[PDB]
Structure formats: structure tokens, C-alpha cells
Amino acid sequence: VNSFSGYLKLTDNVYIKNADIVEEAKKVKPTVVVNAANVYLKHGGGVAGALNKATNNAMQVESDDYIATNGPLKVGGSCVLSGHNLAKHCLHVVGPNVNKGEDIQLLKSAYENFNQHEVLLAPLLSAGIFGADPIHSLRVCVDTVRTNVYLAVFDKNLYDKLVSSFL
Numbered sequence: 001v002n003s004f005s006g007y008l009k010l011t012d013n014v015y016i017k018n019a020d021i022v023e024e025a026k027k028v029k030p031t032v033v034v035n036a037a038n039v040y041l042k043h044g045g046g047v048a049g050a051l052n053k054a055t056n057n058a059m060q061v062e063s064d065d066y067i068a069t070n071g072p073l074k075v076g077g078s079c080v081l082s083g084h085n086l087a088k089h090c091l092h093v094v095g096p097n098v099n100k101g102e103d104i105q106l107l108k109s110a111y112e113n114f115n116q117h118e119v120l121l122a123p124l125l126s127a128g129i130f131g132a133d134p135i136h137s138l139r140v141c142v143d144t145v146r147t148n149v150y151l152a153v154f155d156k157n158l159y160d161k162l163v164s165s166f167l
């Protein structure tokens with residue numbers, strides 16, 4: 001038993017809710033919150049800008065030191081950093097950004113990072129400002145992630161469409 005509330009059950013291991021990931025994080029304080037990152041860990045908008053704003057920019061400061069030491073992430077890759085005031089850890093995961101021309105096949109690789117963590121609070125990768133089909137992202141999630149994932153979808157209208165089309 002965990003502390004996530006009002007999630008609809010999609011599969012054995014995938015749950016979904018119409019919620020702002022920042023508000024879910026602040027209420028739950030999960031072990032892992034997933035950030036929808038880019039390779040430079042420049043957290044400007046969408047999930048990344050919203051989480052970073054909620055950390056008072058501490059996420060960005062930590063991320064800049066990470067990049068200065070390690071260089072950019074790979075598309076499809078990830079790193080574990082602090083969750084600051086939102087979670088124990090933040091798993092920064094880079095899904096492909098279709099609005100930049102990146103291979104959508106890399107979305108499966110991105111979701112594979114979730115399997116290194118038993119339970120995660122996460123957004124829909126590559127969707128929203130990253131430009132990919134959200135129904136496809138949810139499908140890849142369900143077909144790739146084997147650990148327990150609690151998906152927070154910000155847009156109400158999209159959430160209704162995702163559930164109603166899941167089948």
C-alpha cells in the first residue's frame with residue numbers, strides 16, 4: 001500500500017489521474033518524481049519548468065553542475081538527481097522531442113529508465129510541448145514499464161481522451 005489517491009487503474013502496474021505533477025509531488029512526497037527533461041537539463045516549460053519553479057530554481061542550479069561535470073544526456077537517457085522539496089529523488093528522463101525531429105522509437109528507451117525504480121510519479125513523456133501523439137505515449141508506457149507508475153496528466157481534456165480511448 002502507498003499514498004497515491006484517486007488514480008484510475010489502467011493495468012497491473014499503471015495508474016492515471018488528471019493532475020499537475022507538481023501538486024501531486026507536494027502532497028505525496030514520492031520516492032521518485034520523473035521530470036520530462038531535455039539533454040541539457042534546461043528546465044524552461046512543461047513539466048520541467050513547473051517542477052523547477054516549485055524548487056525555487058534549486059533543480060536548475062543542481063542540473064547546471066551536473067552538466068558541467070558530465071555533459072549532456074542522451075535522448076532516451078536519464079539521470080537521478082535530488083527531488084529537492086518535491087520528492088526524495090528526481091529521475092530526469094529525456095524523451096524524443098518531435099518538434100526537433102528526434103526518433104519516436106527512442107520513446108521506448110526513455111520509458112525503460114522507469115524500470116530501475118519500484119514506484120514512480122511521472123508525466124507523459126514526449127507528449128505536450130515535446131510534440132508526440134499522447135495516445136501513443138501512454139501505449140508505450142503501458143507496454144514498457146513493469147514497475148509501478150502513477151501518471152499525472154495536466155490537461156483535463158487530454159486525460160478524458162486518454163482514459164476513454166485506452167480500451
Ligand SMILES: CC[C@@H](CNc1ncnc2nc[nH]c12)NC(=O)CC1CCCCC1
Nearest residue numbers: 020021046047050123124127128152154155
Ligand atoms: C501530456 C503531457 C503533459 C505534460 N505537462 C505536465 N504534466 C503534468 N503535470 C504538469 N504540470 C505542469 N505541466 C505538466 N502536458 C499536458 O497535459 C498539456 C496538454 C498537452 C496536449 C495538448 C493540450 C495540453
